[PDB]
């Protein structure tokens, strides 16, 4: 299973004129390109080395799409300000995200798309990819407007063909990294709290992709009667890391075991201390 | 043969802020609606009585299309200023026109669309209605841009279906006027110049539609040697008028006759002084 998805964000600035706009693209968990109008180079640039061997036709074409989009969003922004009777004095945000996913069969599986204003679901493309859905009694107009203009039509086109076709290309141009799995370096740490309790912290480092599972088990049994878990975080080198802890009564340390599941592992792993 | 066509105009106002924008719609030679942003009431309004019996859904919907359009043009305006390296200090014009025509069979015949900047052909929709055509080296970008976005696609949709469907409706709702033929009131006038020459002026008033033909001819043979003709002009009541004059030797007036052709006439008409 793989995916190609973008995340566009537009933020209004009352004083500074033109709204800030940013687009970033991803393949699975890897950002590969991006656009930012507040950058020295207001154009689409690579964020992954395996992109660098692309022609100027590409970068120019993409830079256009991006620019046009920034404009339409500028409009949409004022349009919305209208729908909600808001003043040009406040700041506002409009976000849009879309992606297409491939199944195991390496063929189209599902696609999606949706907008959101001031951090709230606004409009959404339906599963069938042929109809929209206002999700805010304000989005109502925007709904029909789009349904008359038949916008839904080619969005489906892009998602179904273009998106896929290119996703493949990207997978090839970046196989080395994209398709390369990197299993986690594991280990446990002991941290005494009181005279009767200590803390076992199961670590997992430098892994990829980000999907992973850590679980604390006593004498075969299950557990979390003190299992604190932290949100998977980025290492900063392209890989991730995550840890799960649990408070245990001293001298009973051997009883507990940490289980780790990751696609990069031939089979799960169990640690103990 | 009938037609439904609009004419949108956008003019930049250095200083006054937002560019002036105006849309007007016509069925054959009759203007029926219009939009103007400067106007006290900025929204789509009727220009023909036979429109007044239309629901608020209509007027609201149209007012939206108009508004959105004024926005995109505002953008297009700056965009173009770019393509040509022009300053915000000068004024500029962007015009767009489109129409669909019905044949005698009362079915789709032809459709069209084209833009123009500062009074010069800029971009154009091809006959097949599936491709654009830069008509300047600047429009080159705009060409592909549109061809990638597949704008041509639904423009064709509108033209082929929507445009037609509605044209019909308009014909019915206004049959009483749009279908009533109004033949011209004719007559000749004598205007002596010297004791030797005089001017014969063949008049044609209050007719509709505007298509018409006036021909001065001597002894039944065609003529041009002193045929001054004026461009068909509007009466101001919905009908038109036009006249053709010719200088003739005093005494030879009987040799001259004016011929008039108009769809509202069972057969052509011959006038002599």
């Amino acid at each position: 299973s793989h995916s190609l998805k973008y995340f566009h964000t537009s933020v209004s600035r009352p004083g500074r004129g033109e709204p800030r706009f940013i687009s970033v693209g991803y393949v699975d968990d890897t950002q590969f390109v991006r656009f930012d109008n507040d950058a020295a180079s207001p154009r689409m640039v690579p964020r992954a080395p395996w992109m660098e061997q692309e022609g100027s036709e590409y970068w120019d074409r993409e830079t256009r799409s991006a620019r046009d989009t920034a404009q339409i969003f500028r409009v949409n922004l004022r349009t919305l300000r209208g729908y909600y009777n808001q003043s040009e004095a406040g700041s506002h945000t409009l976000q849009w995200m879309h992606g297409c996913e491939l199944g195991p069969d390496r063929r189209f599986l599902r696609g999606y798309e949706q907008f959101a204003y001031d951090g709230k679901d606004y409009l959404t493309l339906n599963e069938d990819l042929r109809s929209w859905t206002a999700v805010d009694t304000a989005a109502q107009i925007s709904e029909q407007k789009s349904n008359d203009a038949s916008e839904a039509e080619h969005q489906r086109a892009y998602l179904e063909d273009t998106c896929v076709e290119w996703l493949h290309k990207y997978l090839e141009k970046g196989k080395e990294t994209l398709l390369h799995l990197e299993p986690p370096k594991t280990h446990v740490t002991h941290h005494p709290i009181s005279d009767h309790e200590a803390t076992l912290r199961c670590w997992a480092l430098g892994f990829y992709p980000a999907e992973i599972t850590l679980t604390w088990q006593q004498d075969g049994e299950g557990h979390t009667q003190d299992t604190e878990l932290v949100e998977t975080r980025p290492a900063g080198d392209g890989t991730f890391q995550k840890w799960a802890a649990v408070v245990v009564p001293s001298g009973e340390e051997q009883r507990y075991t940490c289980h780790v599941q990751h696609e990069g592992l031939p089979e799960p792993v169990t640690l103990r201390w | 043969s009938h037609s439904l066509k609009y004419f949108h105009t956008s003019v930049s106002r250095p200083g006054r802020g937002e560019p002036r924008f105006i849309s007007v719609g016509y069925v054959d030679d009759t203007q029926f609606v219009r939009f103007d942003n400067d106007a006290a009431s900025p929204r789509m309004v009727p220009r023909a009585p036979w429109m007044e019996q239309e629901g608020s859904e209509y007027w609201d919907r149209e007012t939206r299309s108009a508004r959105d359009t004024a926005q995109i043009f505002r953008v297009n305006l700056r965009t173009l200023r770019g393509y040509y390296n022009q300053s915000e200090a000068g004024s500029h014009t962007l015009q767009w026109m489109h129409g669909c025509e019905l044949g005698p069979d009362r079915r789709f015949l032809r459709g069209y669309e084209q833009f123009a900047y500062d009074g010069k052909d800029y971009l154009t929709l091809n006959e097949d209605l599936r491709s654009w055509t830069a008509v300047d080296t600047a429009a080159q970008i705009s060409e592909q841009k549109s061809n990638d976005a597949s704008e041509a696609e639904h423009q064709r949709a509108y033209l082929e279906d929507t445009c037609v469907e509605w044209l019909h409706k308009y014909l019915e709702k206004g049959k009483e006027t749009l279908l009533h033929l109004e033949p011209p009131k004719t007559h000749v006038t004598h205007h002596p110049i010297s004791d030797h020459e005089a001017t014969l002026r063949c008049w044609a008033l209050g007719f509709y539609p505007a298509e018409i033909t006036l021909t001065w001819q001597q002894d039944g043979e065609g003529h041009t040697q002193d045929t001054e003709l004026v461009e068909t002009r509007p009466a101001g009541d919905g009908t038109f008028q036009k006249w053709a004059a010719v200088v003739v030797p005093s005494g030879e007036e009987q040799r001259y006759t004016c011929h008039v052709q108009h769809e509202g006439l069972p057969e052509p008409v011959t006038l002599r002084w």
Binding site: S65, N76, E151 | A149
Partner: peptide, 9 residues
Amino acid sequence: VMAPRTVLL
């Protein structure tokens, strides 16, 4: 690549 056409709300 990013979609060639966005939506007019």
